[PDB]
Amino acid sequence: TKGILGRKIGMTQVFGENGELIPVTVVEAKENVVLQKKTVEVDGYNAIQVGFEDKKAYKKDAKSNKYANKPAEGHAKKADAAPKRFIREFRNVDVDAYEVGQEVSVDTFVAGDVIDVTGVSKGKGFQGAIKRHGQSRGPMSHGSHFHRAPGSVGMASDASRVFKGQKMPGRMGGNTVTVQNLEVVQVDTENKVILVKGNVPGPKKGLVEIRTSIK
Amino acid sequence: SRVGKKIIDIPSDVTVTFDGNHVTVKGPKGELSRTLNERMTFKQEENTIEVVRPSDSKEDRTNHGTTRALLNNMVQGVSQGYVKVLELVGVGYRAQMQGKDLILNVGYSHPVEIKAEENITFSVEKNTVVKVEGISKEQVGALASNIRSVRPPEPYKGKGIRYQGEYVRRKEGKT
Amino acid sequence: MIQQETRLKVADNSGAREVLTIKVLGGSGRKTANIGDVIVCTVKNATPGGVVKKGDVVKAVIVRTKSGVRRNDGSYIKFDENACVIIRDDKGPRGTRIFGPVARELREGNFMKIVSLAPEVL
Amino acid sequence: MKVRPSVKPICEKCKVIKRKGKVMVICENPKHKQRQG
RNA sequence: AUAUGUUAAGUGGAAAAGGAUGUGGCGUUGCC
RNA sequence: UUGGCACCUCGAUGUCGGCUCAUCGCAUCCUGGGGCUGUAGUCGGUCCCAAGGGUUGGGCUGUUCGCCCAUUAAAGCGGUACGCGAGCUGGGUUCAGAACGUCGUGAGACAGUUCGGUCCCUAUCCGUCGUGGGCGUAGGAAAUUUGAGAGGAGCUGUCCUU
RNA sequence: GGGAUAAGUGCUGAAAGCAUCUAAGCAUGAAGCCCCCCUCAAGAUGAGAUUUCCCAACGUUAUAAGAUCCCUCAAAG
Ligand SMILES: CC[C@H]1OC(=O)[C@@](C)(F)C(=O)[C@H](C)[C@@H](O[C@@H]2O[C@H](C)C[C@H](N(C)C)[C@H]2O)[C@](C)(OC)C[C@@H](C)C(=O)[C@H](C)[C@H]2N(CCCCn3cc(-c4cccc(N)c4)nn3)C(=O)O[C@]12C
Ligand SMILES: [Mg+2]
Ligand SMILES: [Mg+2]
Ligand SMILES: [Mg+2]
Ligand SMILES: [Mg+2]
Ligand SMILES: [Mg+2]
Ligand SMILES: [Mg+2]
Ligand SMILES: [Mg+2]
Ligand SMILES: [Mg+2]
Numbered sequence: 001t002k003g004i005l006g007r008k009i010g011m012t013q014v015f016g017e018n019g020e021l022i023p024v025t026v027v028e029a030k031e032n033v034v035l036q037k038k039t040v041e042v043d044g045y046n047a048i049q050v051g052f053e054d055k056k057a058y059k060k061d062a063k064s065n066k067y068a069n070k071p072a073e074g075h076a077k078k079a080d081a082a083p084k085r086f087i088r089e090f091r092n093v094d095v096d097a098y099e100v101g102q103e104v105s106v107d108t109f110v111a112g113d114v115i116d117v118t119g120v121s122k123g124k125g126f127q128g129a130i131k132r133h134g135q136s137r138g139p140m141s142h143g144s145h146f147h148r149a150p151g152s153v154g155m156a157s158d159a160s161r162v163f164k165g166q167k168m169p170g171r172m173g174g175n176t177v178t179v180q181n182l183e184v185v186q187v188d189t190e191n192k193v194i195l196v197k198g199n200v201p202g203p204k205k206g207l208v209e210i211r212t213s214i215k
Numbered sequence: 216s217r218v219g220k221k222i223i224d225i226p227s228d229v230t231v232t233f234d235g236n237h238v239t240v241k242g243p244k245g246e247l248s249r250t251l252n253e254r255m256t257f258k259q260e261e262n263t264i265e266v267v268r269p270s271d272s273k274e275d276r277t278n279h280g281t282t283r284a285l286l287n288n289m290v291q292g293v294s295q296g297y298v299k300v301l302e303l304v305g306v307g308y309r310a311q312m313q314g315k316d317l318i319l320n321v322g323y324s325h326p327v328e329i330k331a332e333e334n335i336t337f338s339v340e341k342n343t344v345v346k347v348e349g350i351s352k353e354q355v356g357a358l359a360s361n362i363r364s365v366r367p368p369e370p371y372k373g374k375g376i377r378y379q380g381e382y383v384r385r386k387e388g389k390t
Numbered sequence: 391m392i393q394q395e396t397r398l399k400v401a402d403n404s405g406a407r408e409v410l411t412i413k414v415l416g417g418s419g420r421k422t423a424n425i426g427d428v429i430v431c432t433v434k435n436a437t438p439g440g441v442v443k444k445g446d447v448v449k450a451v452i453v454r455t456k457s458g459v460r461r462n463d464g465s466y467i468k469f470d471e472n473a474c475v476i477i478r479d480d481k482g483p484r485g486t487r488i489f490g491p492v493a494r495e496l497r498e499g500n501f502m503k504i505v506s507l508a509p510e511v512l
Numbered sequence: 513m514k515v516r517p518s519v520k521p522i523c524e525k526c527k528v529i530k531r532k533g534k535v536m537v538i539c540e541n542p543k544h545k546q547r548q549g
Numbered sequence: 550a551u552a553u554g555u556u557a558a559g560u561g562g563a564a565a566a567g568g569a570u571g572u573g574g575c576g577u578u579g580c581c
Numbered sequence: 582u583u584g585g586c587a588c589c590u591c592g593a594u595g596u597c598g599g600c601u602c603a604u605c606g607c608a609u610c611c612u613g614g615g616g617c618u619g620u621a622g623u624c625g626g627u628c629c630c631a632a633g634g635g636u637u638g639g640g641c642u643g644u645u646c647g648c649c650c651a652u653u654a655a656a657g658c659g660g661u662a663c664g665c666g667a668g669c670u671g672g673g674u675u676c677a678g679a680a681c682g683u684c685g686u687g688a689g690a691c692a693g694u695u696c697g698g699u700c701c702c703u704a705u706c707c708g709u710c711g712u713g714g715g716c717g718u719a720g721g722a723a724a725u726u727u728g729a730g731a732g733g734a735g736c737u738g739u740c741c742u743u
Numbered sequence: 744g745g746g747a748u749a750a751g752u753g754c755u756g757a758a759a760g761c762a763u764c765u766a767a768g769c770a771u772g773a774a775g776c777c778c779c780c781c782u783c784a785a786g787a788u789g790a791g792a793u794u795u796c797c798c799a800a801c802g803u804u805a806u807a808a809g810a811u812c813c814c815u816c817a818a819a820g
């Protein structure tokens with residue numbers, strides 16, 4: 001029913017009521033604004049569009065993404081908002097309960113809420129079968145010349161080909177990942193911070209999306 | 216002999232309104248409606264109705280018998296209705312009315328609730344006797360079947376929910 | 391972190407001195423046991439005159455590990471050695487005396503007699 | 513249920529029927545239930 | 550396409566001993 | 582499977598076992614549903630549906646197989662050149678040395694045994710895993726997206742209560 | 744969790760006075776099927792949708808929105 005955008009700051013720990021140790025992820029979710037309401041009538045489905053982080057205003061001869069371009073400035077100005085660095089949609093919210101241009105404060109979530117956190121996992125670059133697919137090494141001694149190779153990739157005359165989906169070296173990480181059934185440990189109104197039990201995908205400063213757990 | 220060729224003596228209270236191919240039998244005890252076969256003739260007198268088949272194939276005899284049986288069942292259900300009786304055997308086996316639904320205590324960790332449907336009314340007389348009355352014969356049979364299948368009878372002691380008059384095959388248990 | 395072929399000192403007076411882990415109980419493919427888990431083991435060394443003889447295949451509960459355990463409050467206990475106690479079917483120790491400190495975790499496993507006999511529970 | 517290619521009455525109360533294209537025997541004696549297959 | 554019929558199994562479009570109120574044509578017959 | 586046949590390959594289609602990596606069938610080992618029981622219960626026997634997932638770590642032997650130890654819900658049976666050596670090993674097996682038993686007058690040999698004994702190749706095409714450039718998408722662009730379709734996931738124990 | 748099913752289990756019900764789960768109808772029923780969960784996905788050439796930005800004269804020359812070259816870099820490689 002709820003959603004908000006934030007940046008992952010880092011990991012720390014808090015002590016629970018019973019003295020239990022709760023590892024937590026600090027998510028900073030300032031400056032969230034509803035930019036657009038998509039509806040079944042116009043777009044074919046219901047969603048709100050949320051911009052997260054304020055950008056600098058447009059200027060001529062801007063060289064980087066720090067400054068809004070004219071299409072982005074117009075789109076944001078339609079919501080009476082500053083242009084935003086990150087923009088994402090939430091289809092799990094009630095379209096009625098939002099006004100275009102309203103803020104989305106962290107206080108929308110309460111302690112004990114069960115949430116799903118979505119983000120882009122850390123990149124690992126080109127990685128082999130051992131690291132990328134958890135495969136086993138060959139022997140490291142006893143004459144072996146097979147240590148980190150992927151092994152056999154097919155059978156023989158039948159099928160005289162490698163099947164689709166064969167696990168092989170390649171770029172690893174940098175994929176969208178949703179971690180389900182995390183919990184809100186604390187919401188701190190100042191500093192606009194949400195404390196999430198456990199760890200969430202991605203590097204520090206990366207964008208995360210928090211939604212009320214679907215399950 | 217034959218079943219479909221047999222005539223039906225409609226009740227004086229029941230108004231068998233033959234809506235063409237479709238049929239609708241409003242009577243003292245309720246109303247019924249289902250579309251009879253689209254290849255049969257349902258010509259009726261003022262006080263009687265007699266079904267006739269237009270063909271002679273296997274489908275002709277089969278459809279004629281089933282159509283006449285359905286019509287007679289609708290007439291008898293409008294007139295007198297239908298009663299299904301269930302009996303509970305076993306220590307602690309009881310049933311009760313929670314308003315319209317029926318609760319059964321049949322030895323599970325939980326009771327089982329049997330909800331009432333339209334034109335169906337339940338009734339549990341003693342602790343261990345139940346009854347399913349209604350106009351439609353098929354619906355009454357189906358509800359009684361569900362009530363019985365909550366806990367069907369068992370051979371070693373006859374425990375469970377049995378039909379009134381059901382013969383339960385019994386077996387000595389080699390205790 | 392006890393696995394197959396791990397050797398543990400015995401912390402009772404059952405007669406076994408050192409045992410070798412044959413199996414970690416608790417499900418298919420389980421590799422490692424820790425404090426409070428039950429293992430199958432063979433007696434490698436035994437004290438003469440004891441009840442449990444060298445070569446016997448017995449069951450033991452781990453009461454001390456070098457890897458130690460982590461507790462719910464973020465605190466840890468680690469020991470300088472790995473030790474176990476030979477138990478009967480009903481979890482009671484086969485011996486009459488327990489030596490060395492044992493971890494509090496044996497309370498959760500209902501090894502209450504072993505807990506009572508130990509000089510120290512930490 | 514007896515599932516076998518040879519479906520035939522075992523006792524005098526056995527009845528041979530055809531249900532959904534399968535030759536079956538139904539009887540008061542549950543041991544005599546058969547389905548061809 | 551035309552005429553008469555058969556099949557309801559997609560049988561047609563891979564198989565046997567054996568089993569079976571599946572259905573059609575033929576008959577010799579019995580009770581009524 | 583042991584074979585029968587001798588149709589492809591003798592200007593070479595690398596043989597057993599293991600390792601790595603799988604993939605498919607169902608005649609189902611476990612788990613799910615169900616009928617019969619010479620099914621009281623707890624357990625079983627047998628048959629039917631069911632291939633989603635799961636289906637072990639050691640001792641001996643080159644072994645496959647098998648026996649054993651200890652587990653497990655279970656430790657299923659098969660196909661894929663008895664899957665997989667331009668992926669690995671090389672213990673075994675068709676190599677030169679040597680020895681035993683045995684046979685042979687002998688050189689030597691084996692319903693046998695024993696110790697030792699070089700595993701080459703920089704990937705062109707298809708295939709597969711990743712990752713870019715071009716053009717198209719009836720103006721050009723920035724961002725947010727629907728989802729035709731595709732992939733992934735799918736297991737199960739013990740205890741308490743009733 | 745929902746929907747449809749397998750083996751089954753039925754209800755109603757004739758053909759065939761009876762009986763019959765089936766022939767017409769009506770239900771119920773599996774870790775299995777289709778969804779529900781996660782990810783990719785319009786080269787889906789059927790190339791989809793929404794919001795916002797921009798607007799020229801005479802093939803050429805210079806441009807708009809927008810980008811790139813080049814340079815400082817890393818959470819990416
Ligand atoms: C390591 C290099 C050698 O490769 C191999 O030995 C192997 C591993 F590649 C090899 O044995 C291949 C696989 C062989 O082929 C197989 O032959 C079988 C009969 C049949 C099989 N298939 C068809 C079923 C074939 O694949 C064979 C005959 O080589 C002997 C190939 C032929 C063409 C052959 O003779 C070639 C020329 C062979 N050879 C004689 C080596 C002769 C042995 N040797 C000599 C040396 C050496 C010489 C000088 C210096 C140094 N430092 C070393 N090292 N090893 C070389 O001088 O070089 C190679 C390529
Ligand atoms: Mg390994
Ligand atoms: Mg190496
Ligand atoms: Mg027979
Ligand atoms: Mg066909
Ligand atoms: Mg066919
Ligand atoms: Mg052959
Ligand atoms: Mg010839
Ligand atoms: Mg050859």
Ligand SMILES: [Mg+2]
Pocket residue numbers: none
């Ligand atoms: Mg050649």
Ligand SMILES: [Mg+2]
Pocket residue numbers: none
């Ligand atoms: Mg099968």
Ligand SMILES: [Mg+2]
Pocket residue numbers: 632633
């Ligand atoms: Mg399966």
Ligand SMILES: [Mg+2]
Pocket residue numbers: 636657
């Ligand atoms: Mg298996």
Ligand SMILES: [Mg+2]
Pocket residue numbers: 663
């Ligand atoms: Mg092979």
Ligand SMILES: [Mg+2]
Pocket residue numbers: 666671
């Ligand atoms: Mg080899």
Ligand SMILES: [Mg+2]
Pocket residue numbers: none
């Ligand atoms: Mg090969």
Ligand SMILES: [Mg+2]
Pocket residue numbers: none
């Ligand atoms: Mg060798």
Ligand SMILES: [Mg+2]
Pocket residue numbers: none
């Ligand atoms: Mg001699």
Ligand SMILES: [Mg+2]
Pocket residue numbers: none
């Ligand atoms: Mg050697």
Ligand SMILES: [Mg+2]
Pocket residue numbers: 728730
């Ligand atoms: Mg789709």
Ligand SMILES: [Mg+2]
Pocket residue numbers: none
């Ligand atoms: Mg396609």
Ligand SMILES: [Mg+2]
Pocket residue numbers: 737738
């Ligand atoms: Mg479980």
Ligand SMILES: [Mg+2]
Pocket residue numbers: none
């Ligand atoms: Mg488009």
Ligand SMILES: [Zn+2]
Pocket residue numbers: 522523524525526539540541544
């Ligand atoms: Zn019988």
